[PDB]
Nucleic acid binder design. Structure first.
Length: 130
RNA sequence: GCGCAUAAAGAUGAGACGCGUUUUAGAGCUAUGCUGUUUUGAAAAAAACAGCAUAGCAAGUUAAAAUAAGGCUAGUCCGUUAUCAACUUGAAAAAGUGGCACCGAGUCGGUGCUU
DNA sequence: ATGAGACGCTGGCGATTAGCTAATCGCCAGCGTCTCATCTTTATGCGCC
RNA sequence: GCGCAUAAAGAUGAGACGCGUUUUAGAGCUAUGCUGUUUUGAAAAAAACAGCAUAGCAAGUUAAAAUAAGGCUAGUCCGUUAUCAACUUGAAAAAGUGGCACCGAGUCGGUGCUU
DNA sequence: ATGAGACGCTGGCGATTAGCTAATCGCCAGCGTCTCATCTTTATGCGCC
């Protein structure tokens, strides 16, 4: 860094370059944000690696459902509303497959999760009875 | 809202010790086979000269170098950590820089004024 | 007081000849101590404009 | 500007003949070695059963298929050549379609009107 | 008339693992005949509104 920031053009000429655009030398730190297609963003992880730059904007319903269904805080209160929420978990079992759809579209749109996603789907079908 | 007791914790900075790493020196060897071979020559053969391969062995502990590359500020000093968005000035420091009434809301889209 | 102007197998093969990133995954990451002091800060415990 | 003589040339269309190509049939062979092997078996070994390799040989002439793929129009017919710029209609045929006074001239650039 | 809120080595290697046009040049191209007729056209040679 010190040797490059001192004489940049001389360093590039020493590296093995000819006819170097002096005004086209961009300093790119880590996590430099870039965007390509369908809102798919990628962050510059290095000079030879990138990072995922998109979040799946999921509605509040699925979030609260996951909280109550996964049993995150033992949901203590008055037993009545706890049992109704338990019933609400047993009823909205389609939220599972809806989440699977959400992950599939978001992963096929940004992640490019292909074979890995197939392994995930196979595991979900194998464990759909759980 | 301090002066305070008990029991903890953190942080800072020095001073030093165990290795370790990688190199070199650990003068490791034996036999067999191979070719090139000064080779005895006109060739053959090595003393395999040169290496190669096959097996079989044998010891094995430690010593030295440096230890961010390096730097100059030549000190027995410094150099791995805080401290970096884009942007225009400004040497740097530092400054400035992107509107808003309203409707929707998929990585946002418009909209009045209107950049 | 006559003597120039008029120019091919190539394309479609093989078969040389030559040469290059990329996608997948695994591995594996210098670390050991002590001394010395130094300051903080926290848990609890006590006071009215 | 024809009727004409000499010497040439071209073009057209039929009718047929020589091959050729590539396949198959030219029943080619011998010995040796190899493995799998029903194998005599519990294995061995082939009769190498199966192929393989090494060498050595031997003949060798011709016969048949089709000959643009094919097509239908089933004829004993057709199919390699003229005949194709872009473009809009129009089935096709066929039609229409892109300016120009002026200055320069690198595969052209402008320009008045102005497409 | 108490019992939740605070969630990892990854990047940088090797080393698999996988896979693909392109640039250069050479070769080598179905061909043999005849018959039959058929028309043209050319060189030269001959004539005035």
């Amino acid at each position: 860094r010190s040797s490059f920031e001192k004489n940049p053009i001389d360093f590039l000429e020493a590296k093995g370059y000819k006819e170097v655009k002096k005004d086209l030398i961009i300093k790119l730190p880590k996590y430099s944000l870039f965007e390509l297609e369908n809102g798919r963003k990628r962050m510059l992880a290095s000079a030879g690696e990138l990072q995922k730059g998109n979040e799946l904007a999921l509605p509040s319903k699925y979030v609260n459902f996951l909280y109550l269904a996964s049993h995150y805080e033992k949901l203590k209160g008055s037993p009545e509303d706890n049992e109704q929420k338990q019933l609400f978990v047993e009823q909205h079992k389609h939220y599972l497959d809806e989440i699977i759809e959400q992950i599939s579209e978001f992963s096929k749109r940004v992640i490019l999760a292909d074979a890995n996603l197939d392994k995930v789907l196979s595991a979900y079908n194998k464990h759909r009875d759980k």
